Symmetry: D2
Subunit: 251 residues, 4 copies
């Protein structure tokens, strides 16, 4: 009776119960999805296993997206358990700490740029490509972005470049996978309460709804985009940010 009843959805980047990924997993399970999860390094096997149990699942698989072999092995393993995949949630995203603090050029190096683009941008369509052989015709792929892709935000720096490439990959993936029937979207999420205070307070004071978004609100938006309720929606970057993107705040 839930709006994702019978959908099988693989989620990446579940590291804690304050994750956007956790919020989405919770919303998805409530609406009747069956879930599977990735984790990075055998050191995190136990932790991810406990999360999966919370969501009524035993399906966890290692996947460091830096490694082509691991990406390919993920879907070979997953296919031994599921005949098809209906949803993928891409919620990973890394830049070296210097590359997203202080001045943009101070933190810029060829390697910092490379890693940021490889993990935060390349990995989405790499996963989509590796999943394609087992995707259902009406599957939905979801990634996460930030307003820093669209306008210059202090400190976001190299990550802003990488998220811009990510949101472009959303549009190109939509075209590539869409004749089959597969949809591809992103949520551009506002910051979540858990110098970053400057941002949280500013957003709370300047957003149209005068409040920060919660992982529950982002989770519900993601569940919607993963479902057949959203079958008319693809190639979209949906803002879930209390309307902050639509104003000139503070002015």
């Amino acid at each position: 009776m839930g709006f994702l009843d019978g959908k099988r959805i693989l989620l990446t980047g579940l590291l804690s119960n304050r994750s956007i990924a956790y919020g989405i997993a919770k919303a998805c399970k409530r609406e009747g999805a069956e879930l599977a999860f990735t984790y990075v390094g055998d050191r995190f096997k136990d932790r991810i296993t406990e999360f999966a149990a919370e969501f009524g699942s035993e399906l966890v698989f290692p996947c460091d997206v830096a490694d082509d072999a691991q990406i390919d092995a993920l879907f070979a393993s997953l296919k031994t358990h599921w005949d098809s995949l209906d949803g993928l949630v891409h919620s990973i995203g890394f830049a070296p700490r210097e590359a997203i603090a202080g001045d943009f050029l101070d933190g810029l190096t060829r390697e910092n740029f490379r890693i940021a683009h490889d993990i935060s941008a390349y990995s989405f369509p790499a996963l989509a490509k590796a999943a394609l052989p087992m995707l259902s015709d009406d599957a939905s792929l979801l990634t996460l972005s930030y307003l820093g892709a669209e306008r210059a935000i202090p400190n976001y720096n190299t990550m802003g470049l990488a998220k811009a490439a990510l949101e472009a990959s959303v549009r190109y993936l939509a075209v590539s996978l869409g004749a089959k029937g597969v949809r591809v979207n992103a949520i551009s999420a506002g910051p979540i309460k858990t110098s970053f205070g400057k941002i949280l307070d500013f957003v709370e004071s300047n957003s149209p709804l005068k409040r920060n978004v919660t992982i529950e609100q982002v989770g519900n938006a993601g569940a919607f985009l993963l479902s057949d309720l959203a079958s008319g929606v693809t190639a979209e970057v949906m803002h879930v940010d209390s309307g902050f993107n639509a104003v000139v705040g503070g002015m």
Copy 2:
């Protein structure tokens, strides 16, 4: 446990079972909402009363948005039935025939421009303002737009200017009403009769959209039901494309 359970929603622009408003009404009713409807002219009262009955409702009210007396009376009447309003769907718009055909300048006149903007853009925030005193604190207001607001589309002409002004009102309304808790959004819907040039747009979108298909009132209805609900509580000031991804490509090359 429909996701709009207990919500009270007023819908404008329901003229047929092919209407975008009809699709939104069906989805809202499926998810547990109670519905009320508007109509223009006593000559449509019997027909909207029939449609309302189809959605288990007896609540219909005249509202020609060209007339301040009708806009100012609507929510006074509604209030006698419902103490508060949780949703409003604005799905109305008009421009004179010549203002949406051929060359943009040939069809341009002051009165054509005035009408198009009065009915298609001004009416949305006008209804919001009249509704304000009875809106629930978590109410949600939804309007409908088109890609012609964003980029120039053949024939759309003066309606493109009025949809741009409508999309701007979504952002300004979101700010005005947001502290209270009210959300304001638009759906930019793809094309959904026998109009030859419109048939060409439908064919182009089917061949060139990412999903290779035109959208349906069911798909637009569900998106609308979502934006109307607490599942969309983090979403305001948004223009959401429900158009098979068409706005995101350069088609035809």
Copy 3:
């Protein structure tokens, strides 16, 4: 050798030496344009005649854009002086005061909305239409907008709607007039004399400074010239880069 040499350009909206239109007039005259000017109300005839003389021109014409008769008489009048028009600068824009102060809904009325859209948006394509029979095939039409068209700015309110319609008219005009060869563009100018809005822009713009009417004027002159023959349907921000950031954090 000026990049607008020979170009005949009509400018609306010149009310003082602080007007955006005055900066564009300066930049255009510097690059060799011949200039003509409009004014609203017989009361302002002498003061516009004086600005015109500063720019070496005697061509001044009444034009209240609310009045169809004035719009059509403007072009009948100008045609007796100039066989063809190479440029038009639309720098007019008005909303009743309550419609651009305070809360959006408090100032919303059907008549406030109608006036704001009629003067600030409809007048641009209306002037284009009246001008068309005398426009040179490579003419250039320029209007002025503001970031308030794109994102909700405090107090901008009904003018944010009007400027969104105006920017849309730039794209539809460009399509309508483009096969003949006429280009159509907008500059989205930063704020220009409130001290707090200006201070926020000075502190948060990438260039850490407010734009000047000399900077907007030069960008205008460029778009008016054949140097910009590849540019149409564009909304160019001339605002010290303020549109491109999230300030205040």
Copy 4:
């Protein structure tokens, strides 16, 4: 009396008299700038010295942007001739053939992605940063982009992602360099005369019903490089006969 009189400007990506960089070079020279040029590989030193000579210049320097040492050496060299630099034109951009033809996923590989972003996106702010110690306070940096950054265009594929990253770099650079006074912009240029189809479509559906020329892109570039554009930064200016602004072909 040109509008770039006295400005010293460095141009990358000049490979032929049909290069966008050649058009921008012509316009800048016309407007009074002094030019310097980069080239890739010993193999091309002669052809660039010639082009340079066409524009009254003997300042040519090797610079493969895949290489940190070469980027740092360019400005070390340049400084021995120019005490300060007023403009930079970044007009380079590569993706492997497979990564910019056919289906997006067929051409996607990790290395294709890496190369496209490294040469077409990263290189711009990389040159900015290495130039910074000799940049004049009113300098202007310009890069070249394409509509495929904003919307999905057939075959553009991995390059669309790299151009999106480049355009974002324009906004971050503008903030980083703006307090000093340096401006940073992009021109999103239309295609210049599979590709035949693209040019035909633009000529049929653009508002001006014509493709843009390197002379039109050049004049826009010279403007953005000049003090005439001193109010303009963080901007992606379309020079594409209005094509970006329409839904063509319906």
